[PDB]
Amino acid sequence: ATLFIADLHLCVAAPAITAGFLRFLAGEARKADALYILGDLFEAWIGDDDPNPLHRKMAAAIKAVSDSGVPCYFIHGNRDFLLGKRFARESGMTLLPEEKVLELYGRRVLIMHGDTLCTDKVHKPWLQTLHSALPSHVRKRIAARMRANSTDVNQNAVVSAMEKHQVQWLIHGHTHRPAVHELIANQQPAFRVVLGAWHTEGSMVKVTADDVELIHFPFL
Template structure:
């Protein structure tokens, strides 16, 4: 049965080889058989530039390229951790970079896909941070810093982000339903797929008097999370990590 696969929020890093192993296994055993693979952001824990000589990045790029060369197109939407993934890495990986919002046809159902952080409008501090970090001139300056300096900045941001999450109420970091409906109405769809919140679920609600659905992808911290969409419907699936001991 044909299907399209979606993943997000893997947060790949050298410190979590178990996640990397699960991802590589998923790519080699499952993604190659899909009609398409969509990565909806935060594939990496952080990204300091396409020029970073990271063995992990080369490994991931090779897995994507092997998938695309076997006939499964790979599409990537930036997340809040890896929004600086650029054309150089995309070319190496054989994947297509998409804008932050895209409507795709999934077996006859127009579907809006995104990372999901723009839906969390109650978190004003994060939205302000997001606007600043998307300034093109700031990214241009950052990419011209020495690699060691960029790594230090990224590590500092990660630390502050972790502390900020501890200090905020969970509902502030979740999506704002009014914003969900606004963006779905603007896109002219009744189905939305996103990640970012790490709260895998399928939410059914009413939009302009008609049934609508929001599907949230899970993270890969304790297990893999995959959304499979086919002609017969959608299914949120989990993947157990292999014992690394």
Template sequence: MSLLFVADIHLCQQESAITTGFIHFLHTRALKADALYILGDLFEVWIGDDDPNPLYQDIALALKVLNQRGIPCYFINGNRDFLLSSRYATACAMTLLPEQQVLQLDRQRVVILHGDVLCTDDKAYQSFRRMVHQRWLKQLFLYLPLSLRLLIADRIRANSQRANVGKTDNIMDVNQQAVMAVMTYTGASVMIHGHTHQPAIHTMDMDNCHYRAVLGSWHQQGSAIKIDAAGVTLVEFPFCS
């Protein structure tokens, strides 16, 4: 068994090297896995499954080919692409998962999630998250013309970047009590998440038998977590290796 987990690729038309690197990853490393899990923020921004952006079509084709080769792909929404829904998932032949999923791997329970819900010290972000995840607001947004949706998304992203300038690293990182609460509730011995862009594998304080594996972003290189017979491994690699 070999499972791959990625997150925070942040694909967009302005970053062609990242797109090329991710497609190369799908054609090489991902083909050697038994399954691929994408834990959110596959795209830098997502304004609806009806967006005809050619980039989205290219990624859908690459993911569908992966499925045709017998490697299933699973997706958990991130904070950037929380509006990605069943229409696009079907085009990719990937399975949508809830925001928190437990995998039973032999005797090991693994909980996977994007990770933004763990950053509970960032009160402003959590308040914003609760607001934009309201069903009525998401439906209202998706009724708007694409051009207006893109304008709103760009404005929100710019405001977020300005707000983050004044936040400390501690505020933007996960809260340990929130992590422990999820681990205890799910009975998992391993947690895998992204969002914080701080790749590492942390040994939990409880008994040194629990681990929190954090995925890196794909700004300058690829990042993945691999689970196989050797255990849980953080893998980082150049885009075209």
């Protein structure tokens, strides 16, 4: 089984969530084929080496999952888009681009945080370099945050991303509204599975060869 979670918004002031995440990593995650964390794992992020005991503890708990044989992957959210390679190495996670297609048990599945779907130069390299100065997953987040500091997902964006990636399944979070949506893409049926935030209960998408399901579980 391949597991997907997001929107934990971990912080020192919310230790029950952190405890529930540790239980998850030490139990369910150990039995998975892989674990995908689709952004907003932390409420905020600046420096990979910030003095934060919470960061050290989470990195070691995640690294203990991957060390046990369960690969771990991370797609940045709008809260933790500065999380970098150093922390990925500390935690044993692979960082993924803002949109990624997986081949899960014969099916193509698009994963992303979901904020780039909203829910509120190229020809010349020397010129292109200037635009790609920061990784795309940082450039778009920084621009949106700056605009929002100065002053539901868009359906056209959903379709457009599923036709661009030739995909009938999409998993994301960000909106904090867990649900399963049906739609049309690529002249076929398509589905968009939305994760929930961990403010009061955990949630995951569990994908197997036979089933996908959106599951909620208490922190215990």
